[PDB]
Amino acid sequence: FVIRGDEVRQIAPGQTGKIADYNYKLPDDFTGCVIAWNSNNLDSKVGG
Amino acid sequence: RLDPPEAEVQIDRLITGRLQSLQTYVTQQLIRAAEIRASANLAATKMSE
């Protein structure tokens, strides 16, 4: 998915925040990895 | 007062403390029971003899 650059932290397990609370929550015992990379150039439009 | 993700640590601390208390109590009871059983064997011998 695509998220605001400041919300990446919220993706950690057992953490609060709007995204982790009402959009996508990882289990407290999550086992795996998280990949996040800047997509400004490919997802940012002059008109928004 | 705490979100479960961090409250689990406090719960674990309390569980460890109470479990240690129970183990100490049971060990004391075992030793006391051994002593009382020795006394009871002596009392039975005294009764018989």
Residue B40's Cα: distance from chain center in Å?
22
CA-nearest residue to A29 within chain B is: B5
Q: Spell out the long-range contacts of A37-44 with Cβ–Cβ below 8 A and sequence spacing 24 or more.
A: A38/A5, A39/A2, A40/A5, A43/A2
Rounded Cα distance, A6 and A40, in Å: 13
Please report the resolution in angstroms: 3.0
Residues of chain B in contact with residue A14, where contact means CB-CB under 8 angstroms, are 3, 5-6
Q: Contacts of residue B6 in chain A, CB cutoff 8 Å?
A: 14
* Alpha helices in B1-49, H assignment, sequence order: 4-48
What is the per-residue burial (b if ≥16 Cβ within 10 Å, else e) of A3-41? eeeeeeebbeebbeeebbeeeebbeeeeeeeeeeeeeee
Beta carbons of A28 and B3 less than 8 Å apart: no
Number of inter-chain CB pairs under 8 A, A vs B: 8
- State the structure-solving technique: cryo-EM
Tell if the CB–CB gap between A16 and B4 is shorter than 8 Å: no
